């Protein structure tokens, strides 16, 4: 019976660019080599063109 | 909240949680995926609930 | 207790103790109020952050 | 119409294949990529199953 304080969080992840992200350890972009892709969460493998 | 960095690492270790279940994402590696969409719903209920 | 448990988060269930989810055998609890808890506080037990 | 039938049938078992990939079987989401990103390999392989 004691008061218990709830909190919830809709983390929406809708099809749309993304506006909230985490700590950042982005890098610079390399070309026509595969590479482990974290663009905005989204991971993959392949080259840039 | 949106149009900001959120670093939920901190917030982890900040204090305890008497239930913490995630449901969908792991907690874990929210660090590391963009989301488009964050709410956030906070009140105080009992504990029977 | 509750998080002693194979694949939870928190400090004891990642700082201090980990377990492996490919668990052949129990989790044995029991209150030991009685004897663990002394008239005046004790703080022989230690934990991390 | 006897040669071509033979290429338009090989032509659609084919393309039905592939877009059964788009297809959740179940899961939460169809691609494989995104679930190893967001979710524990104790709930992921639930799911990736």
Redesign the interface.
């Known amino acids: 019976?004691?008061?218990?304080?709830?909190?919830?969080?809709?983390?929406?992840?809708?099809?749309?660019?993304?506006?909230?992200?985490?700590?950042?350890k982005s890098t610079n972009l390399v070309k026509n080599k595969c590479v482990n892709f974290?663009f905005?969460?989204?991971?993959?493998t392949g080259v840039l063109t | 909240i949106s149009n900001c960095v959120a670093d939920y690492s901190v917030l982890y270790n900040s204090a305890s949680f008497s239930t913490f279940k995630c449901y969908g994402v792991s907690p874990t590696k929210l660090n590391d995926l963009c989301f488009t969409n964050v709410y956030a719903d906070s009140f105080v209920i009992r504990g029977d609930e | 207790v509750r998080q002693i448990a194979p694949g939870q988060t928190g400090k004891i269930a990642d700082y201090n103790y980990k377990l492996p989810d490919d668990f052949t055998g129990c989790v044995i609890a029991w209150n030991s109020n009685n004897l663990d808890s002394k008239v005046g506080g004790n703080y022989n037990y230690l934990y991390r952050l | 119409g006897k040669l071509q039938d033979v290429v338009n049938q090989n032509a659609q078992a084919l393309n039905t294949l592939v877009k059964q990939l788009s297809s959740n079987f179940g899961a939460i989401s169809s691609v494989l990529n995104d679930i190893l990103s967001r979710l524990d390999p104790p709930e992921a392989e639930v799911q990736i199953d």
Not at chain 1, 40 to 44: D, E, F, Q, V, W
């Open positions: 019976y004691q008061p218990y304080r709830v909190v919830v969080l809709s983390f929406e992840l809708l099809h749309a660019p993304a506006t909230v992200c985490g700590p950042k974290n905005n969460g989204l991971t993959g």
